Symmetry: C2
Subunit: 114 residues, 2 copies
């Protein structure tokens, strides 16, 4: 089911480089919006998208925690991320799936769960 979450970033261009080019989420839109540059990405195969925003000051840049996105191969994702210079915690098993966390340039933590 469709869901959209707003990730607080300090520099939208650097965030685009990270999420689209480094992590490999697909770019869905990069166009003017009501509050600023509307920059929207989503994992391939997913119906959950992230908007990389800078206009919600109650959410300081890099403050996001506690987000998990489904993946079909968390070990593959982690190997690719570490190869590309990204900090990764995990993978680790839980009763609810096999999960890992990584941080974006501002410190937002993105979780992946298989």
């Amino acid at each position: 089911s469709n869901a959209l979450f707003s990730v607080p970033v300090s520099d939208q261009e650097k965030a685009k480089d990270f999420y689209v080019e480094t992590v490999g989420f697909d770019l869905l839109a990069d166009q003017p919006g009501v509050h600023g540059r509307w920059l929207q990405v989503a994992p391939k195969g997913a119906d959950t998208s992230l908007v990389l925003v800078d206009w919600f000051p109650t959410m300081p840049p890099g403050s996001l925690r506690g987000l998990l996105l489904r993946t079909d191969d968390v070990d593959a994702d982690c190997a690719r991320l570490q190869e590309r210079g990204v900090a990764v915690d995990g993978p680790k098993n839980t009763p609810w799936g096999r999960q890992a966390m990584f941080s974006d340039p501002d410190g937002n933590v993105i979780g992946l769960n298989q």
Copy 2:
């Protein structure tokens, strides 16, 4: 595709009352956990869930913005919310289904889109 977001609340019992009874989300879990009480809800038929947490310092209670969840009937949701005393911003028209926003007791802003 599965996704999980953490919503920062202050009074977890009040938040449970709000998300489960006022808004009408399903209760998926309510049990003691590693970082605190694990309280998890989700819209009916959704694969996106919300965990109502109080343990992320970078996410103060009520600070969350920019979250949008699918609904099949935004007008019905708004009618139920207003019957229960919740102010609703909207609903207002969009290129594919109308949307609406409202605040939880802490001030987190939740969006629904048809």
